[PDB]
A paper describes a structure:
The yeast diadenosine and [name] is a Nudix enzyme with pyrophosphatase activity on diphosphoinositides, dinucleotides, and polyphosphates. The active site lies in the crevice situated between both β sheets. The longest helix (α-1) contains the Nudix box (GX5EX7REUXEEXGU), which displays a β-loop-helix-loop structure that binds the Mg2+ ions involved in diphosphate moiety orientation and catalysis.
The most outstanding feature in the ScDDP1 overall fold is the presence of a remarkable insertion (Pro103 to Pro128) that projects out of the Nudix scaffold (named as nose from now on). This insertion is not present in the human orthologs of ScDDP1; only the S. pombe ortholog (Aps1) shows a larger insertion in this region. We have produced a ScDDP1 mutant lacking this region (Δnose mutant), which allowed us to conclude that the nose is not essential either for in vitro protein catalytic activity or folding. Similarly, on removing the protein insertion (nose) specific to yeast enzymes, the stabilization is notable (5°C), while the protein retains catalytic activity. The smaller [name] Δnose mutant stabilization gain upon polyphosphate binding suggests that part of its function could be the recognition of polyphosphates in agreement with our structural findings, which reveal that the nose residue Lys105 is close to the polyphosphate chain as well as the nose border residues Arg102 and Arg129. We have designed a nose-lacking [name] mutant producing an active and folded protein that depicted the outstanding influence of the nose not only in polyphosphate binding but also in all kinds of substrates.
Residue numbers in the entry: 22 to 165
């Protein structure tokens, strides 16, 4: 039920850089694969979905119980990895303004969630070994 690139054959994923009204803090969730690594909400595009905004906002709700307004398109980043060969993932990110953070959401028992300063969020994605996600974060309007 997943969607792949007709060029690279890379898996199409969409996610959100969820920033507060003041643009000081960003919403991070713990990885499911590894419980101590901090990432941002994102997930596979599905066949029915008409655009990437739909995937982004769906995954943002499921993984982080975040509701908000998409204010910007941060373009794409790739999971370019060791050796040669095409990327495995093509990520489409959007900046979202956090309107509401719900206590309950589909994966609130599988993950932790917390607002971080730019400084600490940058360290977390390094620690998490996800510089593609840090690229996307740096494209946002976060204060540093
Ligand atoms: O759908 P899968 O084939 O299981 O893909 C998983 C899944 O990615 P998605 O969220 O995009 O589905 C993991 O994310 P979780 O939802 O389990 O958190 C992600 O782990 P991260 O949490 O680090 O993103 C992991 O990537 P990794 O290679 O780091 O294990 C990735 O595997 P793929 O390489 O097959 O995409
Ligand atoms: Mg996911």
């Amino acid at each position: 039920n997943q969607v792949y690139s007709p060029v690279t054959g890379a898996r199409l994923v969409a996610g959100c850089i969820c920033l507060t009204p003041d643009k000081k803090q960003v919403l991070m969730i713990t990885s499911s694969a590894h419980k101590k690594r901090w990432i941002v909400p994102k997930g596979g595009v599905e066949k029915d979905e008409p655009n990437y905004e739909t995937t982004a906002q769906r995954e943002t709700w499921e993984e982080a119980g975040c509701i908000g307004k998409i204010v910007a398109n941060l373009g794409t980043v790739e999971d370019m990895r060791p050796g040669g060969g095409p990327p495995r993932t093509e990520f489409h990110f959007y900046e979202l303004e956090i309107e509401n953070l719900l206590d309950k959401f589909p994966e609130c028992h599988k993950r932790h969630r917390k607002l971080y300063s730019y400084t600490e969020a940058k360290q977390n994605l390094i620690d998490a070994k996800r510089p593609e996600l840090l690229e996307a974060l740096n494209r946002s309007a976060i204060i540093k």
